[PDB]
Design a binder for this molecule. Structure first.
Ligand SMILES: Nc1cnccc1C(=O)O
Ligand SMILES: Nc1cnccc1C(=O)O
Ligand SMILES: [Co+2]
Ligand SMILES: [Co+2]
Ligand SMILES: [Zn+2]
Ligand SMILES: [Zn+2]
Lengths: 327, 327
């Protein structure tokens, strides 16, 4: 077995190796990368997503989300308060203001300490889930808007044509903006490129130990757990590395910097935070190995959790009716 | 001036000519094709959208629309009554049933006569605007899911990056299903491929005479006109070729058959109907020549009309606030 400790692996493809996305994902998994739940891919030195980021200030963040925390420093939930629209230019200026800017710190470890100590006492604003892409149409390699669709993958594997289209999303972040513990919809893969700005710190639980995190979550969020058998689908729960360690949950951490890709693998629980003003782009994808995870993915049917129809309809026909009632 | 009578032109590209989409659209316009408002493109004999259509019955039509008419035979409006979900297999069976099937007829002209005589007395069900594609991912030429985006076109022409993603839609039709008189959102181009089944008959007004149609529409639909300065954006008004002829409106007609593409050009008003069970796929696109049409496109701000944000925001900043109130 490759990567038996489930370490987060870092890959440095050559430009030749960067030319076939599916092939390289499969190569990564041949080295056991998937066992960590997360991998970093450093693009070839001659690769670029686009020429410059000088012309992005007029992008509109239609519904910025103020992330309001409740609980304790290491165990909290966050809810999203909708704010008025602003441009990326206005958002960037807000992120760099005295109220929201990254504080003085010695290094990543000091910043991480400050995040978990102080996160709940501030309510940063996140420009998340904006449909769009910052890849140049002429970028041929690892262009997240030119990947094959999950609908075509399901068709290729299962022989069924389905409706739906999957496209990338942009995430404009600032210091303390947070992504809660979750796996992807239908336990899909995700790929995330950090286009510009300050880093993004990730935490991840190996897929083989995901149920351990779920068990801890039910204990730490009893109200949420009673409300929904798959409440982590609501994407609101945060648990710090110290609390995970206290409870024996196996996990790893890594910091993503501008110009780097992160891939999350099926049923790899992850969470994290942004260091300062940045912009990432992400999309879900599938491989043949995903199908069996799709079939077993837990579903939120309480109505709180936000193409999905067809995947549940085909892979989980028994769940489909009740899941559809929740929607 | 090419094509001064504004005739609908039909093109037969070679496989070599079929290899550069933008180039061929530009070639078509060099021959005056755009003046008609609509063109037909017959693909090369060796081209195909996909291998077979044997595996499409499990596609879900989440919200089939029953098209209910009001008015007179040649001048009517239609509203869409939402029906319960059905699969394409179930829809196809309904379309072929005695209640909904194409009636006996001698030819296209007889069927057209029957449509305009009898359309208002039936309420056919249309599986319209389903996000998805039936093109094989391996189809390299004129794959409507692999076109360059309107957002990238605007960026390339105007130097502004914007949010948004544009993807194709599927249309499952039956006899008498109808598309009302309209131009595309922001007076964009559209491209439509008829994947399978019975034909689709199109009517079109040359872009240079669009305001003549608008004037007639205001006279024929006085209530709708008073309610909204751009009510044709609601996509509910039908006017027959006989009534257009009586009122001196220049127009043309053509019937699209399975395996053929239709392109609508900026500000080319069009309408039509399906002959029987079929499936079409369509998407909007842009070229450099569209920009000036985008800037002048009329907007519905009464709230009735259904990526758009950014195009109005950048090309029509003066209209943006009031348009946003309507939404
Ligand atoms: N929202 C997310 C979800 N999964 C991974 C990363 C993020 C992010 O916000 O960067
Ligand atoms: N809905 C439409 C809009 N424009 C052109 C064609 C159609 C169609 O229904 O085929
Ligand atoms: Co994620
Ligand atoms: Co149209
Ligand atoms: Zn739930
Ligand atoms: Zn209106």
């Amino acid at each position: 077995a490759q990567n038996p400790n489930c370490n987060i692996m870092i890959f440095h493809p050559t430009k030749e190796e960067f030319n076939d996305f599916d092939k390289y994902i499969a190569y990564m998994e041949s080295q056991g990368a998937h066992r960590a739940g997360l991998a970093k891919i450093i693009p070839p030195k001659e690769w670029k997503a686009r020429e410059t980021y000088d012309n992005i200030s007029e992008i509109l963040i239609a519904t910025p989300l103020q992330q309001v925390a409740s609980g304790r420093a290491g165990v909290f939930t966050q809810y999203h308060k909708k704010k008025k629209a602003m441009t990326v230019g206005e958002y960037r200026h807000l992120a760099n203001s005295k109220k929201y800017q990254t504080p003085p710190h010695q290094n990543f470890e000091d910043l991480e300490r400050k995040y978990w100590k102080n996160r709940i006492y501030n309510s940063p604003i996140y420009g998340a889930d904006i449909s769009g892409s910052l890849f140049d149409e002429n970028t041929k390699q690892w262009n997240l808007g030119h990947l094959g669709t999950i609908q075509d993958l399901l068709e290729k594997e299962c022989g069924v044509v389905i409706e739906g289209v999957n496209t990338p999303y942009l995430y404009f972040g600032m210091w303390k903006t947070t992504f809660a513990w979750h796996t992807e919809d239908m336990d899909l893969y995700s790929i995330n490129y950090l286009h510009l700005g300050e880093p993004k710190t990730w935490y991840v639980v190996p897929p083989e130990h995901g149920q351990r995190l779920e068990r801890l979550a039910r204990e730490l969020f009893p109200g949420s757990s009673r409300g929904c058998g798959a409440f982590l689908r609501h994407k609101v729960a945060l648990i710090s590395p110290t609390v995970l360690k206290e409870n024996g949950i196996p996990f790893n951490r890594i910091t993503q910097e501008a110009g780097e890709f992160m891939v999350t693998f099926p049923y790899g629980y992850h969470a994290g935070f942004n260091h300062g003003f940045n912009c990432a782009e992400a999309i879900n994808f599938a491989t043949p190995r995903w199908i069996d995870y799709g079939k077993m993915a837990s579903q939120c049917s309480c109505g709180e959790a936000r193409s999905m129809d067809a995947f549940v309809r085909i892979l989980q026909p028994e769940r489909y009716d009740l899941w559809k009632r929740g929607q």
